[PDB]
Design a protein around this ligand. Structure first.
Ligand code: URA
Ligand code: SF4
Length: 205
């Protein structure tokens, strides 16, 4: 996968530039650019989404669109400062299609193959940042570190620890913020509160 493209450095700027030249799977072709993680190596909390979406692919930054604004609202309710986080995604190139009459590029799910191909960047990020806790936002991120059979819905609120993860950080798997954007008002509000709960669990680690 991406392993030959990952240089022997923990400097995030060098890692990010190297990711721009990655060909570890096919996703680099149609994306605009790689979207590396944002934040600094002093971060105690790392958060991992699925992939850059439409806005991120062009902004060059993770979580800048509607799922990002909802995450900001949850972080602020959890009194977590986003500037103090390291925020990234399991795959670094936007996988997408267009529908006729659609108003945006639509994200397509990364295959497990692509996730495994890109995981070396995630490993380099964790080795570089040495977070105390990793928040996994959604199924793809959670499976990247916890195994392909892992179910986010069955482990809400739980602090996890697995053996093949750099520095043995605490892991907290939670709902993807994109899932909180749609549905009945009451279901959204209860899901938002659970997101805030899971963020508080990670920060109290
Ligand atoms: O950075 C982003 C934006 C949207 N969705 C994700 O999973 N990550
Ligand atoms: S998605 Fe990841 S592995 Fe695939 S080309 Fe982009 S950076 Fe490399």
């Amino acid at each position: 996968g991406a392993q030959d493209f990952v240089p022997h450095t923990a400097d995030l700027a060098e890692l990010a530039a190297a990711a721009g030249e990655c060909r570890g799977c096919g996703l680099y072709r149609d994306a605009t650019q790689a979207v590396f993680g944002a934040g600094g190596r002093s971060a105690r909390i790392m958060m991992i989404g699925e992939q850059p979406g439409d806005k991120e692919d062009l902004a060059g930054l993770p979580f800048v669109g509607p799922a990002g604004r909802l995450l900001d609202r949850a972080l602020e309710a959890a009194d977590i400062d986003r500037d103090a986080l390291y925020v990234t995604n399991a795959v670094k190139h936007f996988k997408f299609t267009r529908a006729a009459g659609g108003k945006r590029r639509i994200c397509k799910t990364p295959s497990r193959t692509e996730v495994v191909a890109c995981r070396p960047w995630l490993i380099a990020e964790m080795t570089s940042v040495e977070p105390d806790v990793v928040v996994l936002l959604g199924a793809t991120a959670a499976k990247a570190l916890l195994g392909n059979d892992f179910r986010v819905t069955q482990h809400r609120g739980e602090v996890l620890h697995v053996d093949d993860v750099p520095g043995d950080p605490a892991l907290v798997a939670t709902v993807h913020p994109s899932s909180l954007l749609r549905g009945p008002k009451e279901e959204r509000e209860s899901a938002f509160a659970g997101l805030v709960d899971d963020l508080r669990v990670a920060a109290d680690v």
